[PDB]
Amino acid sequence: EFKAGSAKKGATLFKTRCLQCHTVEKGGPHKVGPNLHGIFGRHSGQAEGYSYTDANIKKNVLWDENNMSEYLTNPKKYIPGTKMAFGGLKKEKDRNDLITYLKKATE
Amino acid sequence: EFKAGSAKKGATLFKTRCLQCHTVEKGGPHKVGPNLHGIFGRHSGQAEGYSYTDANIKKNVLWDENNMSEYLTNPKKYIPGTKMAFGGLKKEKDRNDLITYLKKATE
Amino acid sequence: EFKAGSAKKGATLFKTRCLQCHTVEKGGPHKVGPNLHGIFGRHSGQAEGYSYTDANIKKNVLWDENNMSEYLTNPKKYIPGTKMAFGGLKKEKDRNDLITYLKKATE
Amino acid sequence: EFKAGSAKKGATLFKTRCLQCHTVEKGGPHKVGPNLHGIFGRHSGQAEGYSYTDANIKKNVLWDENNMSEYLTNPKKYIPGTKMAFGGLKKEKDRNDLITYLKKATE
Numbered sequence A, B, C, D: 001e002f003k004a005g006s007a008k009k010g011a012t013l014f015k016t017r018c019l020q021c022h023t024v025e026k027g028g029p030h031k032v033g034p035n036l037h038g039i040f041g042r043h044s045g046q047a048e049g050y051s052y053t054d055a056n057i058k059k060n061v062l063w064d065e066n067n068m069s070e071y072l073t074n075p076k077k078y079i080p081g082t083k084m085a086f087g088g089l090k091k092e093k094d095r096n097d098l099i100t101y102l103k104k105a106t107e
């Protein structure tokens, strides 16, 4: 389901839809949401120093491009009970582009 | 998000995937499943003389082309506890073709 | 043209699409379908103690990953007359994952 | 299932793998195979002036991009007894490119 898209558009989607709550850089600070560096290949709810809902820990997924796409389609449906206040990215090209940027920004 | 496809292809899809349990002709007989004539524009679980599950009755949808496509994607997810033994047409062209045929067959 | 995939999601596919009729572990019970331990590398229809159809027996193939994926694409096409009532896994990444799991659980 | 590919790329496929037996332009001449101008949207076995196997005529398909693709994968499997001596384009992107060229050259 995930196909690599445009990192450049993905960077703008993040600025307007996520940066509000998240930083991406290594060592960056948690805000409302956790810092996201190294999120791919990591278990849900494990960023150091961030205090998660139990449902984000207990979802128990190893983040990759595909379950990230599914999550960002509808976060509170993929993880019922999350404090991530965000409706979701409905359009699949917006998802591929954002995940393309996010991979590059967080690896 | 339903779109008219091939009724000839839908007829074939129907002969091979639905015909076992279903008829389409006006006043046709029930089999394992209810005869389907007049289904579009009727409430669910309302073919005369057929014993549905309570779930199929209480679902309380009015069949049109779009929620029919949603139903045929994963019938047990759309109507939990339905006794229809069918995995689903996962491909969208197949659902468009079948619904194109089915609308012509049952109207 | 099998390529290794995710045993973990192949596990998930097995219990949703196969477990109702099959067990996998060594010495496991026959149910509707035969216990499958040791399937890869055996001729078809050779699980001791299971009562097969003539067609599944006379098919005369040695199961590997490849012809298994052909079979699971359309079981009744590959073995005309089989009493396994299963439509098939149409998508290759689904068969890939399931076969990767099945091979690990049956070897 | 068909996806528009590269007409140019497909043009090179046709010269190497088809032109030996076929021509494409309006009014083009018959060779070993028939001239293919107007093939899409026409019944099988109809090109005016060519002598087809009865197998080709009785396949009774109206050619579009997708049953063309199916066909060119395995001609003898699609039309048993055809007199077209061509093993098939096994790679999916080769069929997409060729059909994309063929649509443009024969419409």
Ligand SMILES: O=S(=O)(O)c1cc2c(O)c(c1)Sc1cc(S(=O)(=O)O)cc(c1O)Sc1cc(S(=O)(=O)O)cc(c1O)Sc1cc(S(=O)(=O)O)cc(c1O)S2
Residues within 6 Å of the ligand: A005, A006, A007, A008, A009, A011
């Ligand atoms: O494969 S990708 O689609 O991901 C992709 C990645 C890059 C890339 O160049 C392209 C396509 S091709 C391209 C597409 C578009 S367009 O499609 O947007 O019109 C405009 C241009 C352009 O060259 S010109 C331009 C415009 C702007 S802007 O005025 O600030 O928008 C900034 C930069 C720039 O060169 S600098 C700049 C800024 C970033 S960023 O992501 O950090 O913002 C990335 C890159 C940059 O070069 S690499």
Ligand SMILES: O=S(=O)(O)c1cc2c(O)c(c1)Sc1cc(S(=O)(=O)O)cc(c1O)Sc1cc(S(=O)(=O)O)cc(c1O)Sc1cc(S(=O)(=O)O)cc(c1O)S2
Residues within 6 Å of the ligand: A043, A060, A061, A062, A063, A067, C005, C006, C007, C008, C009, C011, C012
């Ligand atoms: O059931 S739960 O989803 O709650 C769940 C159970 C377990 C677990 O660790 C986790 C989640 S956390 C997690 C979630 C996801 S996921 O979000 O992508 O699904 C992927 C991974 C991951 O670590 S990485 C991984 C990848 C693969 S591979 O794909 O086959 O190569 C095999 C294993 C493995 O760990 S091994 C392995 C195999 C299985 S079983 O299902 O095959 O029996 C179970 C376990 C394993 O450790 S316990």
Ligand SMILES: O=S(=O)(O)c1cc2c(O)c(c1)Sc1cc(S(=O)(=O)O)cc(c1O)Sc1cc(S(=O)(=O)O)cc(c1O)Sc1cc(S(=O)(=O)O)cc(c1O)S2
Residues within 6 Å of the ligand: A069, A070, A073, A074, A077, B070, B073, B074, B077, B078
């Ligand atoms: O934001 S939502 O996730 O809620 C969401 C709701 C709807 C929607 O179209 C989308 C996303 S877009 C979408 C996203 C994803 S994914 O990225 O999440 O993988 C996969 C798909 C997909 O199409 S494919 C698919 C898979 C299944 S499955 O058999 O259950 O797997 C059933 C249906 C289906 O289309 S049918 C279906 C059934 C229902 S419901 O009423 O029965 O719940 C609602 C809808 C349906 O389309 S509207």
Ligand SMILES: O=S(=O)(O)c1cc2c(O)c(c1)Sc1cc(S(=O)(=O)O)cc(c1O)Sc1cc(S(=O)(=O)O)cc(c1O)Sc1cc(S(=O)(=O)O)cc(c1O)S2
Residues within 6 Å of the ligand: C069, C070, C071, C073, C074, C077, C088, D070, D073, D074, D077, D078, D079
């Ligand atoms: O459920 S079904 O098994 O029936 C089934 C039907 C179709 C389908 O796509 C699939 C499964 S999925 C699939 C499964 C397998 S597998 O089973 O071998 O692993 C291989 C392939 C593949 O794509 S690649 C392939 C290989 C060959 S080969 O050269 O003969 O080997 C010919 C064709 C072809 O596509 S052509 C071809 C010819 C016809 S027909 O109408 O002329 O019979 C129909 C179809 C064709 O694709 S639709």
Ligand SMILES: O=S(=O)(O)c1cc2c(O)c(c1)Sc1cc(S(=O)(=O)O)cc(c1O)Sc1cc(S(=O)(=O)O)cc(c1O)Sc1cc(S(=O)(=O)O)cc(c1O)S2
Residues within 6 Å of the ligand: D005, D006, D007, D008, D009, D011, D012
């Ligand atoms: O199909 S036809 O062979 O009749 C044909 C079509 C077109 C065309 O201009 C010509 C011949 S004339 C010509 C002949 C030869 S050659 O004889 O030496 O090979 C080389 C060139 C060239 O210009 S240069 C060139 C080389 C390549 S390459 O093959 O990828 O390296 C791609 C393109 C390109 O411009 S871009 C390109 C991409 C496409 S599409 O189909 O991918 O959308 C179509 C066209 C393109 O120009 S129209």
Ligand SMILES: O=S(=O)(O)c1cc2c(O)c(c1)Sc1cc(S(=O)(=O)O)cc(c1O)Sc1cc(S(=O)(=O)O)cc(c1O)Sc1cc(S(=O)(=O)O)cc(c1O)S2
Residues within 6 Å of the ligand: B005, B006, B007, B008, B009, B011, D043, D059, D060, D061, D062, D063, D067
């Ligand atoms: O808009 S639609 O896409 O729905 C559509 C509806 C019709 C239609 O003609 C077409 C497209 S165009 C077409 C497409 C295909 S193909 O796509 O299958 O290759 C083959 C042909 C063909 O002419 S030739 C042919 C083949 C056969 S067959 O040997 O029995 O298959 C029966 C008939 C027939 O003419 S008679 C026949 C049987 C039926 S049915 O529904 O009762 O099976 C419908 C029709 C018939 O004329 S109307």
Ligand code: HEC
Residues within 6 Å of the ligand: A014, A017, A018, A019, A020, A021, A022, A032, A033, A034, A039, A043, A044, A045, A046, A047, A051, A052, A053, A055, A056, A072, A081, A082, A083, A084, A085, A086, A089
């Ligand atoms: C504020 C309203 C936020 C918006 C905008 C975005 N995110 Fe978020 N996110 C937020 C919180 C408070 C949390 C923790 C959730 C919990 O239940 O504890 C999250 C979580 C995530 C995660 C999971 C991180 C992990 O498991 O370690 C991801 C991958 C994530 N968020 C991504 C993400 C994206 C891509 C966003 C833009 C589309 C986005 N978030 C916006 C708060 C907020």
Ligand code: HEC
Residues within 6 Å of the ligand: B014, B017, B018, B019, B020, B021, B022, B032, B033, B034, B039, B043, B044, B045, B046, B047, B051, B052, B053, B054, B055, B056, B057, B072, B081, B082, B083, B084, B085, B086, B089, B098
């Ligand atoms: C036997 C295993 C069946 C297959 C094959 C198909 N259908 Fe079915 N259908 C079946 C049953 C037993 C029921 C009643 C379920 C209940 O819970 O009461 C149904 C129901 C439907 C309906 C709803 C009719 C209504 O009045 O609400 C529809 C629209 C329907 N079935 C369509 C359908 C299609 C399109 C099929 C081929 C893809 C198909 N069915 C196959 C049994 C079986």
Ligand code: HEC
Residues within 6 Å of the ligand: C014, C017, C018, C019, C020, C021, C022, C032, C033, C034, C039, C043, C044, C045, C046, C047, C051, C052, C053, C055, C056, C072, C081, C082, C083, C084, C085, C086, C089, C098
């Ligand atoms: C019940 C409806 C079943 C489902 C679900 C699955 N299988 Fe099946 N299988 C079933 C039966 C009754 C038989 C015997 C077939 C016969 O004709 O006698 C089988 C057979 C197999 C085999 C062949 C075993 C052999 O020794 O050759 C295989 C490899 C097999 N089944 C695999 C399989 C898979 C992978 C399934 C999930 C995708 C699956 N089966 C489901 C009954 C049923």
Ligand code: HEC
Residues within 6 Å of the ligand: D014, D017, D018, D019, D020, D021, D022, D032, D033, D034, D036, D039, D043, D044, D045, D046, D047, D051, D052, D053, D055, D056, D072, D081, D082, D083, D084, D085, D086, D089, D098
């Ligand atoms: C010589 C070995 C050929 C090669 C190379 C190609 N084609 Fe062919 N084709 C050939 C013959 C002798 C026939 C008639 C077969 C019969 O049974 O009568 C055909 C037929 C076709 C058709 C069908 C035409 C119709 O009117 O329905 C098509 C669409 C076709 N051929 C296409 C085609 C393509 C795309 C080729 C390159 C991959 C190709 N042919 C090569 C002889 C030969």
Ligand SMILES: [Zn+2]
Residues within 6 Å of the ligand: A001, A002, A092
């Ligand atoms: Zn998708």
Ligand SMILES: [Zn+2]
Residues within 6 Å of the ligand: none
């Ligand atoms: Zn989907």
Ligand SMILES: [Zn+2]
Residues within 6 Å of the ligand: none
């Ligand atoms: Zn650049």
Ligand SMILES: [Zn+2]
Residues within 6 Å of the ligand: none
């Ligand atoms: Zn650039």
Ligand SMILES: [Zn+2]
Residues within 6 Å of the ligand: A048
């Ligand atoms: Zn630590």
Ligand SMILES: [Zn+2]
Residues within 6 Å of the ligand: A062
């Ligand atoms: Zn793991």
